[PDB]
Specification:
The structure is a homodimer of 99-residue chains.
Chain A (H helix, E strand, L loop, with lengths): L1 E2 L6 E6 L2 E7 L7 E2 L9 E5 L6 E13 L2 E9 L6 E2 L1 H4 L5 E3 L1
Parallel strand pairs in A: 3-8, 4-7
Antiparallel strand pairs in A: 2-3, 2-6, 5-6, 6-7
Bound molecules: chloride ion (2 copies).
Chain lengths: 99, 99
């Protein structure tokens, strides 16, 4: 699709069999998703502030569907106030900025 | 242009006769630029944290050139660690996300 920027680029994603709303965020390196159940192994990471503040679970090789386009990548799962789709997944779906 | 997302979308902007590096950030509603001189009237605003923490100067009707495209809009000027081009200016240059 082509997504205009007059409103926040919030889209429906499908991840772990669940539908969620997420922000397509070219300013974010990484993808962070609210607490949820995901299968497979994960490793603990520390994010936010100076050198980590909040504990999240890093899941690799997670498939996320974004407007009918599947992306595969690393997702950090924890108590984030907003689900963020960052560049690590935007590149996977071939997303570009255009003007 | 078409800007890919393999690297942070940092671009050169021209604002107030000066060249700066700025992040094209679809996750940001507004545009914030590091301390600099700009002509005309401004009004004080409070941004960051809960209900404002850092004082900035709001300048309206500022022209910013982004990759050969002029945008006109409101710019908040203050001690930000990164220059951010937010949706208020991205829409002005006709920037869209595409996949
Ligand atoms: Cl499509
Ligand atoms: Cl062009």
């Amino acid at each position: 699709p082509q997504i205009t920027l007059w409103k926040r680029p919030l889209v429906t994603i499908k991840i772990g069999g669940q539908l969620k709303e997420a922000l397509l965020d070219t300013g974010a390196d990484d993808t962070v998703i609210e607490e949820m159940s995901l299968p497979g192994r994960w490793k603990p990471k520390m994010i936010g502030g100076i050198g980590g503040f909040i504990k999240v679970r890093q899941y690799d090789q997670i498939i996320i569907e974004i407007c009918g386009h599947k992306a595969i990548g690393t997702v950090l799962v924890g108590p984030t106030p907003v689900n963020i789709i960052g560049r690590n997944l935007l590149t996977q779906i071939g997303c570009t900025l255009n003007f």
